[PDB]
Every structure is written in structure tokens, then in C-alpha cells.
Design a binder for these strands. Structure first.
Ligand SMILES: [Zn+2]
Lengths: 81, 123, 33, 150, 129
RNA sequence: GUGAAAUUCUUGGAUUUAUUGAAGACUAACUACUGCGAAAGCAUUUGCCAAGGACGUUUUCAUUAAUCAAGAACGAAAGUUAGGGGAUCGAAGAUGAUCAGAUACCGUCGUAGUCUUAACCAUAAACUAUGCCGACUAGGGAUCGGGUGGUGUUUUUUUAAUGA
């Protein structure tokens, strides 16, 4: 009473699925590029970074580790990938 | 008396309150320099205070105006006015609500806030 | 409040981070200060 | 299956399917290796080193970007450790809770957990000596592990 | 633990077929399972299947028509010689005209009839009838 | 005080009233078809000591896995040995009343014990009266913890937490 061709499932259903319960297990997290206020330095960081990453030149913390996702420090201009 | 934010604490800092006025005061002898005893006001903590100093002291003016209108409504045996207090430098907006009482006495009423302290530390 | 929490994006693809109930860009720069 | 325990929780990390290096990455593998060697000379474990490269430097996976594992980079640069870090950590925590029971002999639960820690220690010790990455004459003991980690 | 991955596959197959489900999915996968489904689809007791890679251990989807009575396994792989072919057929299959017991010889994987035609002998996997 | 009296002790006034203080236990209601722990078991505050679950992770290595005689740890209550106090309760025991009825079979004192330290002691209706590890096979609502997304409201605002 639950019909779906698993050969070609919905991308919405795969996105709502668990990360390993996907048809191909892939990672759900990603990376980011940030621009600091102190030096405008673009830095690549993890979306789920367990470390409080700072900028290189200005010692300005970019993100804070909290459980699942990393919480960015305020006033940092970011981009996906 | 009622106001949309709760009155936290009303306190006297009068020199005669601490028993050190130069004269012991006389009813209706308003020409004394120590006639108007200072009374500090504090209301309840609101997370919506104006975070600018002039808007903040003018909101203090508005709350004192609300006290003045309600006292002129329901306490008509007392007299009241506003005196532009300026005794602290570079603040050009202080208003002391001066109350005259038919027991022959008079007081100043002025608002204090944690927001005043936090903006002074910001300064 | 509008210009602070109005979903600012830069010229290059870069969006800033803004917390809840935060109200001034001058205040954000003062936090950085 | 969370052995020596009743747990069955599943909380792990995935893998990107494509085995090659990412497109947006624009660094040097040699700079990466230098950063690794300088970090290990600073004194971190390769797991924490990989975490550091993953967070701060955006290094996705070490075997993806470079043909070598982190431990193989360390050993190639001469910074191979003495024991594998997992056994190091088990020994260190066992000594720590041994001192904790020395402070307070009352915690039978600390006794229980130390027993299970020793069980896992012996299991990995049998495994490592089977690999012979460990010396065959090596032995885990209380005094041995305390003299080792302290 | 999970010992017999192919037998786990076969039991999932038998469970979905006893339910009457239309397609199945198998994780993990290996080449012996590949040849199993190859000769199965050859004998037409099923429909069509497909592999998917994951670089760990792949998955297998089978759309199956209606034609599985029972797929099986002999969990210890016994060496089967020539008379033992007959003995095992008489043991497992309920009637001699149909049903197929599966053997791995050095010449690969095949049923009893093809194994007799090839004159080979080896170990036993399981059966389909 | 019991079903009923009665032993009991109250002019040096009990019970009671108020003001305390000491003792030793206990941690109710909140409290759950909740939570935690291998079980037994675990509810006052705070701190410390470690530990652990689960969730999240593009960290690690690469079979290190399961079942397991021998052996090892724990194991309610009570009980046993050496200490402590020992409020309460309380196997024993001692008595009042033995009155009709047990439909309404006790009342009072009180040793051990009750708790603690150091040991033993290894039983329980120690039960989900139901070997383990692993895989598959109905739905529908829950809840708890973790995380994610967005939505709103409460919330708050150059502050140390943005939580509900
Ligand atoms: Zn910088």
C-alpha cells in the first residue's frame, strides 16, 4: 500500500531520507567560503566544523561548534562551496 | 497608581531623609535650598527601551508626563510641575517631576534605568 | 531593523550572518570592534 | 552494535562517491603535506590533524586529495607514533579512572567500566600483536600501562 | 551476526515474494549473487534485475514476475560428487521433473542438469523450484 | 487506646498552647502506562571527581566480529564478624484485655535488627514465568533525547548567550 519505483525515486524523498538511507550514501554537509570583517579574507570552512575556525591574519573567530551544525560568528560574509 | 510598565522601586535620597538638612524643614517654606528632596525612580526591566540617550531621556519625560496627568486626575489636592534638570553635563534633557504637597512639602522625581547605565558605558 | 534583517547579499556571492533581534549595522561593526 | 554495551545507536559520517579530488580546491599537495608535518611536529594526533584540515583548510579527505593516508604521510616524514592512538587513549583513560578509583574505591561502577576497558584493551592488544605492529613480547598491565602513559 | 550475505538476500527475496511484492532491493551484493540471479533469470523464474554500485558493496534491484515457489540454501557447502547429485536432488526437490539445485564447480556455477551434462562435481549452494 | 474497655501517666499539670534547641532518620506531593543504569538499582541544594548513552561529523584505522566451558566483576532484603551512633519502626520476648463477636483478633514496653565502617554471605514471583548475535516481513498515533528545514508567536535591542 506504499508504491514507488525505487529505480527512479523522487529527489524530494531522497533529500528527506536519512543520509545513509539514500540510494547512494553521500554526505549531506558541505563547505563554505567566508569573508572576515577584520581582513576580508575568504576562508574555506566546514558547515559542521567541530573547531572554532578563526581567520589567518586577523585572529577573528569565524564559527562556533554546536552539535550538528557549526554556528558562525556574527558579521562574516559567507558563501556555499 | 498604574502605568503600562510596573513601578519597580521608589527611593528617597533626601538630605533631610538622611537627617542632615541644614534646617529641619518647615511646611510651605519652599524657599529652602533643601526643600525639594531628591527621589530616585526605577521601573520594571523592559526589553523594548529606546537604545538612544536622547530618545531614552525623552521617554523618561513621557513616563513622568503620564505620572503628572494621572496625579492631576486622581490626586487633585497635590500640585505638580516639571523642572528642566541639567545638573549633569552634556545631558540637556533631564526633567524632574516636582510635586508640592498640602502638608507643605515638595519633592523632585527622576527616573533611573539599567539602560541609562548601559548607554553611559557605551559612551 | 529593516535594513539590518532584510537579507543582505554582497556583489560577489557572499551573504553576511545576522542574529535574531539584532537591529544596527553600526552595532555589528561595534561588536567586531 | 556498540559491543560491551546495550546501545544500538547509529551516528556516523558518509563519503562522497566520486573518488577524485574536488574541483574548487586550488592548493598544493606539497603545501598540504608540509602543513601536516608541521602540525604533527607541533604534536597532534592524525585524527585531530584531519579534523583541522577539514575545518580550517577545507581539506575534504586526505586520501582523496593525496595518494597517502595521514599516518603514512607521518611515517614517511618520520613522525610515526609509538602505539596507535586508540590504544593510547584507552590506556590513558584507564590510568585516569584507576587514579579516580584510587581516590574513591567506592565506585563499583568505575570498577565495572575499568574491567570492560581492560577487556577492550586486551582485544585490541591481541589484534595489534596479531598484526605485529606491536612488539610480540609487549604486554598490557596496570603498572606497565601506568609507566607507559605517565 | 550477518554470516551468509547471499542467504540473507535469498530470504529477503522469499519474504517479499511471499508477501507478493513486485520489486526487491538487496544490499550488499557480490559476483556469486550476480551469477545466481543470472542463471535464475535465464531459467525465467523471475523477471529482470539490475546492479547499482556504491564502492562499498553494491545494491541489487529485481523486478520479479510471479514464478518463485521457493529459493533456498544449504548453509554448509557440502562437496557434491556424482551420485550425491542424485541424492541431493531426491533430498531437496519435491518432484524430479522440475526444480533446480545449484552447484559451484571449478567450471563455475550451474544447476544439476547442466552439471551432469558438463560432467563436473563440486560444492552445493541451494535450490530453486 | 481498640470493635469494646483495660493496662500507661497526668497537681512535681500531662495532653495542649507558644518559644526554641538537640538527636537520628527521610527526601513526599511534583511523579509520568517519563528518565537513567548490565541487573539488582537510581528522586533535597551545590560543587568536585571521573564515566556513560544518543545525535552530528567529507576525523581515524581497516576485520579487529559473534557464541562461549575455565576464570572474573556485580548482585534487593535478611543473616554472620569487628566499630559507631542508635530518632523512628521493629523477628524475639514481656505484659493489659481475653470481653459474646472475630461480622470489628489487639494495647503497651522493648533486645536483635533497621542505618553506617570494614568484611563475608550470592538467594528472590532476581518474570517480559519466554538463548544470544544477525537479516526480512503491517500500518496508525505517540512521547523522550539529538539534529535539520522553514513557518510563525513569545522572545530581545556593542551583550556575554538568541530561549519557548
Ligand atoms: Zn584576517
Amino acid at each position: 500500500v506504499l508504491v514507488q519505483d525505487l529505480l527512479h525515486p523522487t529527489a524530494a524523498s531522497e533529500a528527506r531520507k536519512h543520509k545513509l538511507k539514500t540510494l547512494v550514501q553521500g554526505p549531506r554537509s558541505y563547505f563554505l567560503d567566508v569573508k572576515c570583517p577584520g581582513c576580508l579574507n575568504i576562508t574555506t570552512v566546514f558547515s559542521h566544523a567541530q573547531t572554532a575556525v578563526t581567520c589567518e591574519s586577523c585572529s577573528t573567530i569565524l564559527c562556533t561548534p554546536t552539535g550538528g551544525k557549526a554556528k558562525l560568528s556574527e558579521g562574516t560574509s559567507f558563501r556555499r562551496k | 497608581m498604574k502605568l503600562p510598565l510596573s513601578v519597580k522601586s521608589i527611593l528617597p535620597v533626601g538630605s533631610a531623609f538622611r537627617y542632615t538638612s541644614l534646617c529641619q524643614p518647615v511646611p510651605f517654606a519652599y524657599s529652602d535650598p533643601d526643600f525639594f528632596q531628591d527621589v530616585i525612580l526605577e521601573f520594571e526591566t523592559s526589553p523594548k527601551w529606546p537604545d538612544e540617550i536622547t530618545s531614552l531621556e525623552k521617554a523618561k519625560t513621557a513616563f513622568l508626563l503620564k505620572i503628572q496627568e494621572e496625579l492631576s486626575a486622581n490626586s487633585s489636592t497635590y500640585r505638580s510641575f516639571f523642572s528642566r534638570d541639567e545638573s549633569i553635563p552634556y545631558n540637556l534633557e533631564i526633567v524632574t517631576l516636582n510635586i508640592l504637597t498640602p502638608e507643605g512639602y515638595g519633592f523632585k522625581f527622576r527616573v533611573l534605568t539599567e539602560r541609562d547605565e548601559i548607554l553611559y558605558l557605551r559612551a | 531593523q529593516e535594513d539590518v534583517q532584510s537579507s543582505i547579499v554582497d556583489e560577489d556571492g557572499f551573504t553576511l550572518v545576522v542574529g535574531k533581534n539584532t537591529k544596527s549595522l553600526n552595532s555589528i561593526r561595534k561588536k567586531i570592534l | 552494535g556498540r559491543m560491551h554495551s546495550a546501545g544500538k545507536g547509529i551516528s556516523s559520517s558518509a563519503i562522497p562517491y566520486s573518488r577524485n579530488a574536488p574541483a574548487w580546491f586550488k592548493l598544493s599537495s606539497e603545501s598540504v603535506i608540509e602543513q601536516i608535518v608541521k602540525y604533527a611536529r607541533k604534536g597532534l594526533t592524525p585524527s585531530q590533524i584531519g579534523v583541522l584540515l577539514r575545518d580550517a583548510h577545507g581539506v575534504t579527505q586526505a586520501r582523496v586529495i593525496t595518494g597517502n593516508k595521514i599516518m603514512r604521510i607521518l611515517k614517511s616524514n618520520g613522525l610515526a607514533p609509538e602505539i596507535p592512538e586508540d590504544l593510547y587513549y584507552l590506556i590513558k583513560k584507564a590510568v585516569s579512572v584507576r587514579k579516580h578509583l584510587e581516590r574513591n574505591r567506592k565506585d563499583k561502577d568505575a570498577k565495572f567500566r575499568l574491567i570492560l576497558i581492560e577487556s577492550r584493551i586486551h582485544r585490541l592488544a591481541r589484534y595489534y600483536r596479531t598484526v605485529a605492529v606491536l612488539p610480540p613480547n609487549w604486554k598490557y598491565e596496570s603498572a606497565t600501562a601506568s609507566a607507559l602513559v605517565n | 551476526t550477518r554470516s551468509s550475505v547471499l542467504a540473507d538476500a535469498l530470504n529477503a527475496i522469499n519474504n517479499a515474494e511471499k508477501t507478493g511484492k513486485r520489486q526487491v532491493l538487496i544490499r550488499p551484493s557480490s559476483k556469486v549473487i550476480i551469477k545466481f540471479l543470472q542463471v535464475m533469470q535465464k531459467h525465467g523464474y523471475i523477471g529482470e534485475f539490475e546492479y547499482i554500485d556504491d564502492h562499498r558493496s553494491g545494491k541489487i534491484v529485481v523486478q520479479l514476475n510471479g514464478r518463485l515457489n521457493k529459493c533456498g540454501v544449504i548453509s554448509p557447502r557440502f562437496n557434491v560428487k556424482i551420485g550425491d547429485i542424485e541424492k541431493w536432488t531426491a533430498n531437496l526437490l519435491p518432484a524430479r521433473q522440475f526444480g533446480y539445485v545449484i552447484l559451484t564447480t571449478s567450471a563455475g556455477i550451474m544447476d544439476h542438469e547442466e552439471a551432469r551434462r558438463k560432467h563436473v562435481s563440486g560444492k552445493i549452494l541451494g535450490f530453486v523450484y
